Design a protein around this ligand. Structure first.
Ligand SMILES: *C(CO)[C@@H](O)[C@H](O)[C@H](O)COP(=O)(O)O
Ligand SMILES: *C(CO)[C@@H](O)[C@H](O)[C@H](O)COP(=O)(O)O
Ligand SMILES: *C(CO)[C@@H](O)[C@H](O)[C@H](O)COP(=O)(O)O
Ligand SMILES: *C(CO)[C@@H](O)[C@H](O)[C@H](O)COP(=O)(O)O
Ligand SMILES: *C(CO)[C@@H](O)[C@H](O)[C@H](O)COP(=O)(O)O
Ligand SMILES: *[C@@H](CO)[C@@H](O)[C@H](O)[C@H](O)COP(=O)(O)O
Ligand SMILES: *[C@@H](CO)[C@@H](O)[C@H](O)[C@H](O)COP(=O)(O)O
Ligand SMILES: *[C@@H](CO)[C@@H](O)[C@H](O)[C@H](O)COP(=O)(O)O
Lengths: 223, 223, 217, 217, 217, 223, 223, 217
């Protein structure tokens, strides 16, 4: 399972990349606009993320009509070969995904909330499809059940579109995604950092170090 | 399923190896301090086990910082080709695993307590991951369910990291591990001895011997 | 299922209570210390919540010893009959719960993270037990499975302690609690506000509003 | 399971009551406005249905504020003892439901799309709750799963609110409601008539008729 | 589980009655028109079955219209108190069942092929409902599934209508009906006789016969 | 669950009754004819069993026609109120069961091999129905699945006939009967005696007695 | 679920009782010999536990013969009304249970290893039955599955004998027993202590205390 | 699935082999000492079975020490290429299996009673592992569940050791072994003879025999 960072915060991306467990980044207009304050411009933010992140960086078009989406997608593509164009699940979005797929421009269909939307995006040739599990949880349906159905549908037809679980809110979205077999999760920084932690890891590490000081006063391992 | 001995008692290790039922050994700072009493040095104990044991021997770093871990890891690797460097599940541990994996040094990520920690260790390139089922049992959650989820996750992504079940306390941890399909169990010596035994084996042996006396008084097979 | 509000924010409690969907309130030392700022005193906050909320109001002791816990629990009980004394799952806490239960002081055992702790709290006679599902989610275990096991255990032994699901983070903790059959959930205000809402409710209301205007401008 | 007709068409209602399988009627602003054409007024339509149907007749308020909903509800109730006041799942609607339930005015909470909304309506005291299965099917989720969850939740807490499955589109919504154990379904007239029919019933009747002409010309 | 005989053949009925394991009889116009040949009249056959069979005996109307069905049902009722009037699953049939139930005339709704038809018949007050499993088998659907669903639905609503499994073709229809918990099965005579038999019963008798000859010639 | 002894051997019955876990006895013409040798007559055997066993004793008619079965059943009944008349699943047997049931003579329908035979016997009013699990096993169908279906059928209709599992061959027929909820098992003596035994009981008892001799040399418990 | 302490250590028993979490005690000849060292008499140890403990106290006979068992049982009963006589699963044990049950002496049948032994002990009238789950684990079969079958069997026949799960080794034996619905668990002291504890309880307590210092420096609740 | 005959009775083996359904033979010291009576020597019995049976023939060592086991195993191997050396699951036995497997002497590990013993035997390289299902039945555990777990374990690790189900007591051990997918069953002669037979086979043959006589006396 690939793990992407769901943020436009440079310091978070830099930190998570330096950890070696971040395989790419997803952004959206809200995440970018949060960082586009105090003089910083959204063009600088996107270019700096593309520089820091070896893997896929998903950047969302703001146009809602087919022609503007394709024009924006080509400019996004030109920023670097690791850019992925994020396109909403709409009639014009599906037309744009089909056009861009023929041009070998990688795409990510967003604002997906049920399995048949995800299948339509795959049929248009999309590289990644992003169902939003947290926003389904918000309205009282367990969002992970949609990931499970999409995994089954995609397995049935040997679909090559990657499932990119998005709107992730807690580490059990991540656990269940991995047990289902989703291709990618994208997670806020607070979630990513919690994934490495467990109270019994901290307890056990401290205990081992104290056990060791009984045979090595300096605490070193000399061999 | 490979079976490792979880001990640094040299007498136990020799006895287990000579049954031919032991495929490797795991140690940790506690286990080694137990045997480093009354003049025996921890360096001597580690070197001896590496000599006696033909399979992998897992030896744990004691530094908590990345540089200290890679430095100690390279020294452990230099003691023998069967040495495996045991590295805790932490931010610096994951960084150390990725670097060492690139240097073709085998690694074992320890103090793992849930399936996503195990997945992160696999993503860093670790040779073995060791979830601690007995310490989960201690805090009232069935540790074998974590092994089951890790096996499913690893199957989903064709992950090559081996599942090394650790903190084993009884033969049912071993039985359930084999049914799940974990790659390795590491067991204390008293658990190892119990695995060969059953009261109906003992009874049946005794009976066949008495039956054979009716046809051969000396109890031999003359062919 | 009862729905409690997990906050000491008096403005949140007033709003939730005016909606009529809030059956009680839980607090803890963090929640209260979030409000007791810029002059406000914690004793005044607790008394104000006790006044606003008709239903149970949980207030946590701060002492860690049996004697201090019982003395604090008695002062809490005396602030109002709807007060419930929140007591951590410790050896001294179980002793305190047993004493307070014999004195007919209602109790709530908190910081519970597996089903056997919840059973011990019930054996001490506690009125409510609060397993923390979000903090279990945090450490990579589905916290709702612990609620499922506690419900089965309590059903097996006809236990009268109420399961009060706490550390709730989202509306699916609430849905799963109701399908399991937990007695109570306690929810932060953001979660409480989402429980009434659905986008098809909003859409359908707008549509019926336009439909009606055709026969009644 | 009770079976209500989901229409304001007086001819459909008369026909269906004349069959003996119609236990009540539901309406909404769309359904009434469809028949309030060619000089016919909505007040007369509602009154006519109330007279023809012995069972419950659900009539929706159009106000969106608490005070207007309660005032409308009391007028709807005055029209006849079998009137049930249909109220949307909103903050003001839950407030109106609690007030009306204390006045012993029967209520039906509408525009429900998940199980926790249904639980909130039952906590307010509503007589019926109407989850909309067809509109969930429309957005790609199997609406009958929501009914199954509500049935479990209501069984867990011995809830007396009746589950009134609404937005029914086909006979399998009806079959699945009965197997789940929903209290009521409300169905459009074309669904209702299809429920009595099966091709082997038709085939069997024709053969037995031909069989009987053998021994009785 | 009650066991009825599905025939109009007086000799089969007499034989199965002598066995003590036949609780009642069902007939239909095909079955009767098979026995009213070579001078035998259908009115004699019906009275003769009524006379032989202590338990319920179902006799089907031939009218298709409400008033004719009700008139015929009263004539069938007058023939003996154990007569049960078999009425098809149609609009007029449901109307007649309701009227006849109000007159305390027992009824059996026939030509039922899915669970919702069975539910409608129960709602009209019918004493027995007869789904036709063999004819469903004929068209490629496992007819016993329909029995399972009707059992679940009737349990859900504490329905007092008895499930009378009809169109039975083999002993596994009978086994499955009993495992589901259907109230009654009605069986053709060939099927009935087969239910008592098993080759290991035959073999064991013969061997005990030889065994006892070693001890008592 | 009641446990009956399936034998006509006086010494076995006496032994099992003295153990206090035998609630009655079933016989059949073969079992009796095995004991009716060396001068003993079958009438003496039956009367002696009826004397030893407080509970139900099932004795099989040898006639195959209705009138002879009822006449034999009345003579069997006259031997003692604890006698139960065993009658085969045949057309005449069912007629006899119905007649005897009206006369308040207890009955046991035997040679039952499927669930609908068992239901017909219950409808005739039989006190016990005896499906033969071992003889089904012999012909390649798992005989316990018939007990499970009979239990379900009888539960469905609140049938008061007791399920008396017969033709029992091993202790797992007995275990599965108890887990299903059959009313009675009838077991050969060899099976009954094995039911109390387990190798870990013997091992544990011996170990406890040796532990005790460390604090009480005589091996007694003085209080 | 009642919780008994499986020990004869008086200090453990006093400590456990004073937590109010201990409902009774079980002993056996081994456990008592452990505490009957350096002058302490086994009779004194038994009498003291009976004094300290308000709930049942199970004390095991050492005679293997029926007469010896009933004689010792009556003496054990005379020491206090809370005494329960522990009797092994044997032919003579079952006879002793039936006699003692008729004398209204409470009994506990021990060394049970499968569900039919447990059923036989219930048929003899035993107050408690003790299947040994840890010793089953030792010989490679999951002991908790035996508890599950016994609970089903007892439910089937409305058996009043209480299931007393014994040979408990870890907190998951306890968790699974409660989920199954066993009447009683008896646990060693180190397992008892572990049941109250969890690392997130410890962490959360520590955090609330630090949070409270921001509003109250002395860490008290002034009401 | 291979079917072996579990006996040293030469008459049983000849009969089973003449039927063509016997793929091999297992013996043990009890079975052989049952035959070596009234002058007959055990060495002659083993040699005669090796001659009659084309397939594998298992013969158990009697020594309990590694050195004696290997020396006995080598003499057994030299009696014929179809000989397989049966070795008990003990520490010395596992050592002997490992040595003999490296010498390409086929082995069978016996007295196995749980799935981890079977796994250890496979890790030592044993050709066949023989779990004892009837002796587990004797002590109140369903022995076939152990076969099910061993099959799953062996599938998990692509283990090439063959599962040889032993201590078989009835044809349902055989049926369940085949449904699980065990490689081999070894059966006593009484069981072997029952596997071909069914009363409906006997009945149908008699019936076709009579049917044919109508067209061919
Ligand atoms: C190394 C990881 O494979 C092992 O030595 C582990 O440290 C132990 O198995 C942990 O066991 P304990 O919980 O008994 O320390
Ligand atoms: C009291 C027990 O119901 C509550 O106030 C709990 O302390 C909180 O629900 C725990 O929540 P957090 O994990 O968010 O502190
Ligand atoms: C009356 C309803 O119970 C019965 O006589 C039915 O007509 C028959 O069981 C139907 O059987 P066929 O499909 O064989 O006509
Ligand atoms: C009495 C029966 O309830 C108990 O004392 C048992 O003897 C022990 O629980 C057995 O445990 P061990 O297997 O550890 O001896
Ligand atoms: C050898 C291993 O396959 C066999 O001869 C076994 O020893 C027997 O199958 C065991 O049977 P018993 O339990 O009847 O001795
Ligand atoms: C792009 C799709 O992969 C992501 O940035 C999504 O916009 C977010 O993950 C949505 O999360 P929120 O629901 O929290 O906005
Ligand atoms: C009232 C609630 O029982 C009903 O009239 C509902 O408004 C309808 O059943 C909704 O159906 P549509 O989705 O077709 O509007
Ligand atoms: C009477 C019915 O309870 C019993 O004696 C049965 O005849 C036997 O149990 C049948 O056993 P076999 O199949 O071994 O004869």
């Amino acid at each position: 399972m690939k793990i992407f960072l769901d943020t436009a915060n440079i310091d978070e991306i830099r930190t998570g990349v330096n950890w070696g467990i971040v395989d790419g980044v997803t952004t959206n207009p809200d995440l970018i606009s949060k960082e586009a304050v105090n003089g910083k411009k959204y063009g600088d933010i996107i270019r700096e993320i593309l520089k820091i992140v070896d893997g896929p960086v998903s950047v969302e078009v703001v146009s809602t009509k087919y022609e503007g989406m394709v024009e924006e997608a080509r400019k996004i593509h030109g920023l670097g070969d690791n850019a992925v164009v994020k396109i909403p699940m709409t009639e014009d979005g599906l037309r744009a995904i089909k056009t861009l797929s023929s041009e070998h421009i990688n795409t990510n269909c967003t604002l997906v909330f049920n399995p048949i939307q995800a299948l339509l995006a795959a049929k248009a040739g999309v590289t990644y499809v992003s169902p939003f599990v947290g926003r389904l949880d918000d309205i009282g349906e367990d969002g992970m059940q949609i990931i499970d159905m999409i995994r089954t549908i995609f397995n049935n037809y040997i679909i090559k579109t990657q499932i990119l679980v998005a709107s992730i809110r807690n580490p059990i979205h991540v656990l269940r995604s991995a047990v289902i077999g989703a291709d990618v999760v994208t997670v806020p920084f607070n979630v990513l950092k919690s994934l490495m932690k467990h109270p019994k890891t901290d307890e056990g590490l401290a205990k081992f170090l104290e056990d060791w000081k009984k045979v090595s006063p300096d605490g070193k391992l000399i061999l």
